[PDB]
Design a protein around this ligand. Structure first.
Ligand SMILES: CC(=O)[C@H]1CC[C@H]2[C@@H]3CC[C@@H]4C[C@H](O)CC[C@]4(C)[C@H]3CC[C@]12C
Ligand SMILES: CC(=O)[C@H]1CC[C@H]2[C@@H]3CC[C@@H]4C[C@H](O)CC[C@]4(C)[C@H]3CC[C@]12C
Ligand SMILES: CC(=O)[C@H]1CC[C@H]2[C@@H]3CC[C@@H]4C[C@H](O)CC[C@]4(C)[C@H]3CC[C@]12C
Ligand SMILES: CC(=O)[C@H]1CC[C@H]2[C@@H]3CC[C@@H]4C[C@H](O)CC[C@]4(C)[C@H]3CC[C@]12C
Ligand SMILES: CC(=O)[C@H]1CC[C@H]2[C@@H]3CC[C@@H]4C[C@H](O)CC[C@]4(C)[C@H]3CC[C@]12C
Ligand SMILES: CC(=O)N[C@@H]1[C@@H](O)[C@H](O)[C@@H](CO)O[C@H]1O
Ligand SMILES: CC(=O)N[C@@H]1[C@@H](O)[C@H](O)[C@@H](CO)O[C@H]1O
Ligand SMILES: CC(=O)N[C@@H]1[C@@H](O)[C@H](O)[C@@H](CO)O[C@H]1O
Ligand SMILES: CC(=O)N[C@@H]1[C@@H](O)[C@H](O)[C@@H](CO)O[C@H]1O
Ligand SMILES: CC(=O)N[C@@H]1[C@@H](O)[C@H](O)[C@@H](CO)O[C@H]1O
Ligand SMILES: CC(=O)N[C@@H]1[C@@H](O)[C@H](O)[C@@H](CO)O[C@H]1O
Ligand SMILES: CC(=O)N[C@@H]1[C@@H](O)[C@H](O)[C@@H](CO)O[C@H]1O
Ligand SMILES: CC(=O)N[C@@H]1[C@@H](O)[C@H](O)[C@@H](CO)O[C@H]1O
Ligand SMILES: CC(=O)N[C@@H]1[C@@H](O)[C@H](O)[C@@H](CO)O[C@H]1O
Ligand SMILES: CC(=O)N[C@@H]1[C@@H](O)[C@H](O)[C@@H](CO)O[C@H]1O
Ligand SMILES: CCCCCCCCCC
Ligand SMILES: CCCCCCCCCC
Ligand SMILES: CCCCCCCCCC
Ligand SMILES: CCCCCCCCCC
Ligand SMILES: CCCCCCCCCC
Ligand SMILES: CCCCCCCC
Ligand SMILES: CCCCCCCC
Ligand SMILES: CCCCCCCC
Ligand SMILES: CCCCCCCC
Ligand SMILES: CCCCCCCC
Ligand SMILES: CCCCCC
Ligand SMILES: CCCCCC
Ligand SMILES: CCCCCC
Ligand SMILES: CCCCCC
Lengths: 333, 333, 333, 333, 333
């Protein structure tokens, strides 16, 4: 045996009973798997690396070069106890064997690597949906050892994070990867040090335009064609107005199926409900025209063209909706 | 080896054959994950801590300070056997290692911690849905040892429960965290002691207003516009009344898709079905008007304006529906 | 060590090579989780207890009282091999440790307990759905040992089964818990003894009334209003009849989504399809009225009020449907 | 210890370095769980038994009778290495212990049994859906040992397969269980012997008749009522024809939701699409009638009853559809 | 024991501290399970084989033939550490035992085999959907050892890949299986060698023709029948045009339910939206005809047949749509 494993008790950390042992971390992100709006979490796959020194693993050599071991020797030596804070579920790949790397230098320096998949929560805001921008983070912390026994820091500062060029999401644009560090306090155990990985996401608006914004606009313009039809065709204009109202209600209902039950109004809800009001006022407009015409006929009868409401509605209704779009798209850009 | 583990048989609890061993518990809640109405359960993630004393783990030292071990020594010493009563499923996180903490003082005091996710059942009541308030609880009990062998109590009374400030639910408001204690009896094993964690939830009404209450009101008001149309347009008023009835039926059906098949009427069902009656009576109203007009024409013919029903319906129908809303919102607030 | 475990080979049952060893069973039901109509199975959580005697586990004492062990000693002694027959999936809870209890008396009597969740199949009949009553059972049997080596019986007869007062199902009513016993034969291994747990379930009819029976009745009564409208309004009565037919077809389709593809007619199908016939005959009725009127006009023209069909339909159609309901609800109660 | 396990190295099969060792197999089927059309696989639960001889397990006795061991001794002796070919997933039940039986005779004969659940693929054909008949099979083969080291055969020929009388499927009829045997060749490892279990399935047509065939026929007959209505009611006959076309399209769409995206036409698709053509031609028929009537009026006007198309359509349309059904049901029976 | 396993430490690879050890790979594909457009991944089942030499496993013999071991000896010897890059999830079958083969020759040559199921991501493009062609690949790489310690290559070059003749997909056509090799670099660990398996997929167009292209064409031709109806029937032509617009909108909405929310327009979207424009212009066409007729009547009145727009529309509208189809199918073939 090259290493004298059997001659030491590895239940105690290096420098037991003394100062803390420094540990460095490197991370390479492989891919982001999925994002859920209803559950408000994301899935990430990454490579995690650790650096430390242990004099008990020293062996004699003349080349002074790192040597690689099969990786099942890990379960017999001391290893850090990092865990992902605020995670929902995670696992380590084990095909065809445990994805574990162990390299030991002659002086005792140790390199340890893993391949894990982690699901973590992210508090998203949907006030500006679907034109919103979201920021999420991943947290790494040691579970058992406090800052007085283990010091956790990035190995090379800002250069310790790498990303694969194949990272891509169909619905989101990924940007601004950076790392930060902060302390954490638990009231009954002590102080701990945390590491952060931050990134930003931006949606794509093309799908929502074709699916929601364009059908809504067309249904509104369908109601405007009733102002150019003769008012004597009562069974022709009434069904046109009513059916557009019901179809607009169907479009409104279908949008909410894919989103969580938030307690505030979203940007898309404003567009849909104002459009519903425009179609609803179209139905009331003809009822006023029909009622006034009948009253006039009876008044003229008791003595023994285009109605002004229709003439003005052809101009006011298109003008108001255009003004609404100008204001709406100026606020949400 | 610092601890004389091999010199003792840890298959027997401390004080075996004598009085009970006291055990203290501390809990910190991390987050609540999800709530299911159809399955009537909730998911919680928390940190669980235990306190006890064991003289067999004593070691000599001069500093009199707690020492931390890697946590894989737990499987070789005596550990309590707590379990969650009335739980459906649960697990312990194990990445990158088992989330276990073990700290032993020189005199033998032991601190043990875990990170678990538990799903537990809750009997909810939906009589006042969606304006309901629900209360749920989590129960902790020892499986194997009765009160004559193990005493279970909160470590610091009311101060033993802590909550993270990031706990949030999109649909519910969380309040009133407190802890209680009660005994339990099993007819064939004996008496046990239980610990409780209680909290309260309140829904948000904004989503249900826009989705159910507002579309229902608009469809009712669509039926009222038929009272202002000339009664000679038979193919104009009949389709208007019929189509609103069918659309109201569609709205009623869609609501029940998201709820369990309870055997009592809910608050939302009352609003929807009374609205359906209002629209249904609108269809019968014109049929009476049409029939009476035809009878009058034949009666006048055999001898060789606005009908009174329409005139009164314009006032009675809006007044009745307003009175219903006043009573309905006064009862359910 | 209190027990002389190392001095015996526990690969052989007590009384090896001789008469059978009696084993007693006690069960306490905790809850029933879910019932699936499409898969025809149910989920149950329960506590399972075993009783037997083994002289190899005797230890000296003066108090003659049961002693409790941590439960990880189970994997080193002989334990019965019970399994659930006709089960689909099952598991044993293991948080924070294996839910196992082991108690040994000085003379060698052993008490063993477990907490398990079991899914088992049940052959349900839906001929009278949704007014049906279903009976299901759970079976317990030893896998390896026949009746010549192990005798299985209830510990206290009818008193061996206990149920939690919190057992409840939202859609079903649970009643009539009792236990029975019967032998089983396998053609290639021998005879075995089985234990049974039986219970009965009854549905709640409130949900199905509001969801299926009430909308169906209202759509039929909508078709009857066409008999009171003037027959000269052809474009008014034709759409009314046609649209009710299509809506009734939609209601029929939606019911079958939640049920398995059985090969026999159910009680709810009878109500829906007879209702469809009533609406369908309404459409044919006006076509006969319209055709006869046109023929009469041409006959009178070639020589140079209310039609009798409408008058009789106002009485016959409501009377027939009322008679159908009287017969239908008298058979299915 | 009755068996001299420690005196032998069980890493080598019996008769190592010599002729092959015969192994017999018996199977008893317990139930079939589910069948998936989209994934094209089935789930089966069964008992698997093995027979062989090993002189290293002999023990002295005077009774010459089989003795049963607890089953955890299996992990210390040589056991065959059978696996299920073309399986997707499978597992062995382990509650409350591993479902393993081990019986050894004095001369060394060994009986070994297991309880497993296996999911296996089946290539189904849907050309005659839903009147199709499917055949599937389950394959058993040894993984490591070729025919020169292990011979695999059925223990008792045709009598080696047994089935439980409780096997039942709600949608399928199960028949014709039988077993066969065939050799298999792998280009880089050698020859192997396989065992087969075959069965046949037949669907139930009742559900599809009520759900698809009956609604389709009724919608076609609804279009025929327009031939008996006066041709002067243009706004009465046009909506009747159009609405039946759209409803027929809805019925066609709903059927394909439950089936995989095959690349050939099915039997049910033929019925639905021919029915759509019949309804579509009804709409074109009235357009021809309306156009010819207007032309005739203008021709007669410029000089200063029932149309023949309607008269013939009342006979030709019902006759053609009846002939189609006679041919359709004669081919597919 | 035939092998001297206990006399060596298998935590170090063969040739430790020296040149790299060559490893050969063979693959046989069994089946492809499923393809997901929303998640952009595929599932594959395959057999993986490894070849290497280890002098520590040599044993004496006179026949010079491969010997097969039960496969549980794998966990005690050195085995490569291959893993699938860019995979989402995977597992190894373990019924009725681990699907592992181990064969060792007298000189130390080792053959190792596995049966695994792997899910891997594939970046698909839907610009030409549903007439698109997709290419995907599977990557194999060693996790722990770099090119200086382990050399990875195909055992027999182009002949190392085999496929089962039963591989089939209902919606796709599989072709062009081939293998390639390329190096990979990680910035913090070194150089690695990768192996690739490539294949191509082509969709079947039959389903999409009947489901989307044919219903869209028929609805357009329904709007053309309004040009042959007398223009004095205002309540007859207006509902015909309006209802076809709404039905076309429904067809457009239903298509997008099964596809991911991409940010570019697809081939099917072009056909659907141009068809919607054709139906929309039909509604505006009659409004122009109706308005001009009313103006002409008033102009002639104030002084005290077929309109030209309808005559030309009968020719221009069919001609334009035919030209569009010729261009559309010439580009996308
Ligand atoms: C006087 C007049 O131009 C009539 C025509 C349609 C009528 C409205 C129809 C819908 C409502 C009916 C309700 O009964 C009274 C308020 C509402 C809003 C009516 C107010 C009076 C209107 C506007
Ligand atoms: C006399 C009269 O104003 C007629 C017009 C509409 C008629 C009702 C239509 C629906 C029902 C039809 C049924 O055949 C008899 C009861 C019902 C409720 C009828 C009662 C008499 C009414 C109210
Ligand atoms: C003579 C008469 O009162 C006509 C009016 C509506 C007609 C029915 C319409 C539907 C069917 C059409 C089919 O072409 C012939 C049978 C069916 C059932 C017709 C038979 C004759 C009826 C009943
Ligand atoms: C001359 C005549 O009886 C007219 C009445 C309806 C017309 C058809 C309406 C639908 C189509 C419209 C298209 O513009 C020309 C072909 C189609 C098929 C027309 C051909 C000529 C028809 C059949
Ligand atoms: C002058 C004329 O033939 C009228 C008949 C229908 C009218 C159109 C109806 C829909 C739109 C209504 C809007 O108010 C103005 C633009 C739009 C597009 C109208 C422009 C003028 C048209 C085309
Ligand atoms: C790559 C590297 O840093 N190698 C060094 C080498 O230069 C030095 O001579 C040796 C002394 O022990 O330590 C090691
Ligand atoms: C995006 C970000 O965090 N950038 C920081 C930068 O602000 C800081 O100056 C640098 C040196 O520590 O590290 C990095
Ligand atoms: C933190 C704490 O309580 N430390 C005490 C220390 O004050 C005391 O002198 C010692 C005696 O053994 O025990 C320990
Ligand atoms: C909300 C709640 O349970 N509060 C209790 C309080 O009533 C009690 O007085 C106190 C002292 O034990 O503990 C806490
Ligand atoms: C609870 C119980 O039954 N205890 C008995 C005790 O009464 C008896 O004196 C003793 C004799 O060994 O056995 C034990
Ligand atoms: C519901 C049921 O099974 N009841 C039985 C009862 O019939 C029997 O008399 C009794 C005594 O064994 O056991 C219990
Ligand atoms: C059940 C059976 O076959 N028993 C036989 C027995 O008849 C025979 O006398 C004995 C000789 O060793 O072998 C055994
Ligand atoms: C259905 C089937 O496979 N039946 C076979 C039969 O043909 C054969 O004659 C017999 C004897 O081996 O085995 C069995
Ligand atoms: C199949 C094969 O290659 N067998 C060879 C054999 O021909 C040769 O005589 C022997 C020498 O040890 O090695 C082995
Ligand atoms: C489809 C493909 O990759 N074919 C290659 C071929 O181009 C190459 O010439 C051959 C020899 O290495 O290997 C194979
Ligand atoms: C239907 C009219 C749409 C007008 C959009 C104008 C966008 C202006 C953004 C500043
Ligand atoms: C449509 C009329 C709604 C009136 C609501 C009044 C609410 C009063 C609450 C006390
Ligand atoms: C619509 C008429 C319903 C009549 C129900 C009568 C029930 C009688 C049960 C014996
Ligand atoms: C609607 C007419 C249906 C006729 C069915 C005839 C079946 C004959 C099978 C040989
Ligand atoms: C409805 C007219 C369809 C014409 C299709 C022509 C296809 C030509 C492909 C080159
Ligand atoms: C849109 C409302 C117009 C009202 C015009 C009234 C002119 C007398
Ligand atoms: C809403 C019903 C009004 C009935 C009025 C009758 C006046 C003669
Ligand atoms: C419901 C059918 C009534 C037929 C009455 C015929 C009277 C001549
Ligand atoms: C169904 C088409 C009938 C055409 C008859 C034409 C008689 C002149
Ligand atoms: C389709 C538009 C035709 C316009 C023709 C105008 C002839 C005066
Ligand atoms: C009268 C012309 C109205 C145009 C509105 C944009
Ligand atoms: C006649 C006016 C009625 C108003 C109802 C609120
Ligand atoms: C003519 C009155 C009919 C009443 C039917 C219940
Ligand atoms: C007037 C005949 C038009 C034909 C269009 C294809």
């Amino acid at each position: 045996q090259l290493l004298r494993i059997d001659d030491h008790d590895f239940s105690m950390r290096p420098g037991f009973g003394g100062p803390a042992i420094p540990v460095g971390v490197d991370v390479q992100v492989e891919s982001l798997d999925s994002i859920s709006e209803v559950d408000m979490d994301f899935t990430m796959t990454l490579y995690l690396r650790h650096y430390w020194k242990d004099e008990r693993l020293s062996f004699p050599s003349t080349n002074n070069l790192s040597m690689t071991f099969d990786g099942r020797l890990v379960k017999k030596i001391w290893v850090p106890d990092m865990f992902f804070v605020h995670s929902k579920r995670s696992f380590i790949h084990d095909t065809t064997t445990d994805n574990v790397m162990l390299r030991v230098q002659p002086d005792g320096k140790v390199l340890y690597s893993l391949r894990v998949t982690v699901t973590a929560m992210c508090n998203m805001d949907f006030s500006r949906f679907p034109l919103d921008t979201q920021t999420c983070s991943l947290e790494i912390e040691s579970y058992a050892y406090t800052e007085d026994d283990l010091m956790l820091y990035w190995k090379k500062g800002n250069d310790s994070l790498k990303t694969d060029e194949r990272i891509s999401l169909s619905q989101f644009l990924i940007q601004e990867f950076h790392t930060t560090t902060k302390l954490a306090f638990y009231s009954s155990t002590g102080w701990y040090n945390r590491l952060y990985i931050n990134f930003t996401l931006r949606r794509h608006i093309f799908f929502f335009l074709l699916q929601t914004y364009f059908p809504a606009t067309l249904m509104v313009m369908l109601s405007w064609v009733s102002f150019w039809i003769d008012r004597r065709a009562v069974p022709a204009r009434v069904p046109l107005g009513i059916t557009t109202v019901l179809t607009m209600s169907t479009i409104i209902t279908g949008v909410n199926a894919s989103m969580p039950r938030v307690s505030y109004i979203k940007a898309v809800d404003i567009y849909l409900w104002v459009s519903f009001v425009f179609v609803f006022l179209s139905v009331l407009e003809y009822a006023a025209v029909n009622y006034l015409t009948t009253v006039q006929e009876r008044k003229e009868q008791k003595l023994r063209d285009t109605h002004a409401i229709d003439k003005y509605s052809r101009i006011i209704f298109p003008a108001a909706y255009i003004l609404f779009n100008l204001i709406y798209w100026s606020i949400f850009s």
